[PDB]
Design a protein around this ligand. Sequence first.
Ligand code: ZN
Length: 36
Amino acid sequence: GSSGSSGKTHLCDMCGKKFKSKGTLKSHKLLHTADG
Ligand SMILES: [Zn+2]
């Protein structure tokens, strides 16, 4: 996970996926928190 650039577009530094809305990025983020 590399810290990206402060961009409105909800960007995921965990994998590198960009989203327009939050709810979308959220559900996608939860997936990352699997092992932990
Ligand atoms: Zn991600």
